[PDB]
Amino acid sequence: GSMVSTLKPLKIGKHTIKFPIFQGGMGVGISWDELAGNVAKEGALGVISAVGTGYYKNMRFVERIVAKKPFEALNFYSKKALNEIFANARKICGNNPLGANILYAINDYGRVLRDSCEAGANIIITGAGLPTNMPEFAKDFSDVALIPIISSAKALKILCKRWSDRYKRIPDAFIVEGPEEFRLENLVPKVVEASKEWGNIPIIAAGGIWDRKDIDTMLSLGASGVQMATRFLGTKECDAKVYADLLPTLKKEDILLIKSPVGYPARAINTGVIKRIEEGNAPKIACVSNCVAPCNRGEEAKKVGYCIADGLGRSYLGNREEGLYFTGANGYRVDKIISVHELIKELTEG
Ligand SMILES: Cc1cc2nc3c(=O)[nH]c(=O)nc-3n(C[C@H](O)[C@H](O)[C@H](O)COP(=O)(O)O)c2cc1C
Ligand SMILES: COC(=O)c1cccc(NS(=O)(=O)c2cccnc2Nc2ccc(Cl)cc2Cl)c1
Ligand code: SF4
Ligand SMILES: [Mg+2]
């Protein structure tokens, strides 16, 4: 009862994935070895989030903890944890391709990119910024494919021109994620068109893609593939186990845009530390992990009421009262929790 897929394999750099589908990276601790390993086993691109890896297995692999938080960027972005996450994912998926997702705004971005390459990533995905120096840190890892997340055709042109002038290389792909002209059905064609100036770089559409109908819409607009996160957030294999319990009663009213210490908006569930901020009992802010450069070691966290490293870390640890919980706008459509296998079958059959 599942017709062979008519979707065709997607080549990114030297890497081929069976289905033109990325499971979007999700931190902290949402897309680690069980999720990304099982996604890649099923033939989509599993993506490991490289942010906050110091939290992995309750801070098993860090060198220093202060106040139950990984101490500084070197422990918050823990190379030893990252190595173990990748190794555990490949116990599930073998040599099927795996990405690492690294936000450009993090402190020590270049170290974490090199760490991801050494951990065995085949692909690096980077948004939250304009990542003009991505290949600077990968010179030892030429065959690792490099993919910026962009929200405009202008960004593609600036990136191709700056990479080409400095590295004589251009990106292997672009993920287009909107932040009426920022509607994905308008944005993707504009980016695909602009890409032709540089040699038809595959374009991956992301944001609000729920089912095969959405996938086919994006493909027919010139996208080479899609990236989906919220659907995989509703799988059993999600490494942050709170979401399987929280999502099936989530109502659309409980999803809101919030400011963040990174200087970009996030979409959050009105629960955990978000609820603590309205009640006035939220935790004190005291920058320990120094997670992102735009925060200025607590300046913006104090302004928006929460520390995103602490809050996302607490969610991975199962903390319902003070954790920070993210969702795409479609999160209210998660009515059951299903397996990654069953999800991939629903997205690819026919
Ligand atoms: C819980 C959660 C965590 C996320 N974390 C990251 C992240 O660490 N890095 C990143 O580039 N995008 C992150 N995103 C965005 C997703 O990777 C993805 O591009 C977007 O949510 C796709 O839209 P969809 O959820 O409608 O499919 C996150 C999204 C969610 C819901
Ligand atoms: C369709 O898209 C959505 O609805 C959606 C919903 C939620 C988040 C995102 N994007 S995001 O990259 O996660 C992000 C955006 C703004 C501020 N912060 C982060 N992330 C982050 C920062 C620091 C650390 Cl330490 C860890 C992480 Cl995960 C997108
Ligand atoms: S205070 Fe700011 S920089 Fe420090 S860990 Fe929290 S969000 Fe990151
Ligand atoms: Mg529902």
Residue numbers in the entry: -1 to 177, 193 to 363
The authors write:
Here, it is demonstrated that FabX is essential for H. pylori growth and gastric colonization by retaining UFA synthesis and producing ROS, respectively, and is a species‐specific anti‐H. pylori drug target.
Subsequently, we examined the enzymatic activities of these compounds and found that 8p (annotated as FBX‐1991, hereinafter) exhibited an outstanding inhibitory activity against FabX with an IC 50 value of 0.158 ± 0.030 × 10−6 m in vitro, and increased the stability of FabX by ≈18.2 °C (ΔTm) at a concentration of 50 × 10−6 m. Subsequent structural analysis indicated that FBX‐1991 binds in the region between the FMN cofactor and the catalytic tunnel of FabX surrounded by α10, α14‐α16, β3‐β6, β9, and β10, and inserts its 2,4‐dichlorophenyl group into the catalytic tunnel, pointing towards the bottom of the tunnel near the [4Fe‐4S] cluster. In the structure of FabX–FBX‐1991 complex, FBX‐1991 is stabilized in the catalytic tunnel predominantly through hydrophobic interactions. Meanwhile, the carboxyl group of the methyl benzoate group forms an H‐bond with the sidechain of Arg280 located at the N‐terminus of FabX β10 strand, which further stabilizes the methyl benzoate in the correct position.
